[PDB]
Design a protein around this ligand. Structure first.
Ligand code: CA
Ligand code: CA
Ligand code: CA
Ligand code: CA
Ligand code: CA
Ligand code: CA
Ligand code: SM
Ligand code: SM
Ligand code: SM
Lengths: 71, 70, 71, 71
């Protein structure tokens, strides 16, 4: 088994394996970034609605107050 | 010739080692960044909640003041 | 939940990163072997061709010694 | 700034992943070359030695026919 034949043999193997690893890695990180993204928006919605309640109560406060005066 | 191989492997590990340390360091920092951003969002959520029930007890009291009043 | 998801992903990364670190640590070690064994056979073939080069070399040094002593 | 902190990290990753890919391709490409050089030089040393042995064998053949023709 020639070293030049052994060296080239490794080069085909590397080039192929390295090509497979990249593909898998890219898809993996895609999925993870996806999970986090979903969780982020989920957290975003919560903060969004929580703020709604607050400003909604604030509206009610100055709504009743707007009626306490004429009272 | 084996002096070429011995040279290569020692170069590989010296780099492979440096690569793992720099990578592990990199991920931990990114995880740190994200962790902080999340906590800040949690704090932000926890706060908007406290400021919601706060506003709620107020209207409960005001609507009571409006009722009893005439 | 971002915090809960971050922890999840963080664990998955540490999970695979260790596995992969081995599928490569072993692979790169099995390959440096093929080249290392090939280089040894190669270094041998030379040490064999060189010794042949000096094995036939001396043979000439004798046939000459016979041709002259007979002519 | 959730979606932002996530996007920043995704960009940093994609950026780092690129440089990691181009530094790897170089490193391996050169290390392979180096090994090819050594396997080539050695290879030549073999052919040079083989042609040398075969050269002498030619002599040993005809030089013997002279030991015969004479004797
Ligand atoms: Ca390419
Ligand atoms: Ca990540
Ligand atoms: Ca950094
Ligand atoms: Ca920072
Ligand atoms: Ca306040
Ligand atoms: Ca905005
Ligand atoms: Sm009052
Ligand atoms: Sm180790
Ligand atoms: Sm670097």
């Amino acid at each position: 088994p020639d070293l030049t034949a052994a060296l080239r043999d490794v080069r085909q193997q590397y080039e192929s394996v390295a090509a497979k690893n990249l593909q898998e890695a890219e898809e993996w990180y895609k999925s993870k970034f996806a999970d986090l993204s979903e969780a982020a928006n989920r957290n975003n919605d919560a903060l969004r609605q929580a703020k709604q309640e607050s400003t909604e109560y604030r509206r009610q406060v100055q709504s009743l107050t707007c009626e306490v005066d004429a009272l």
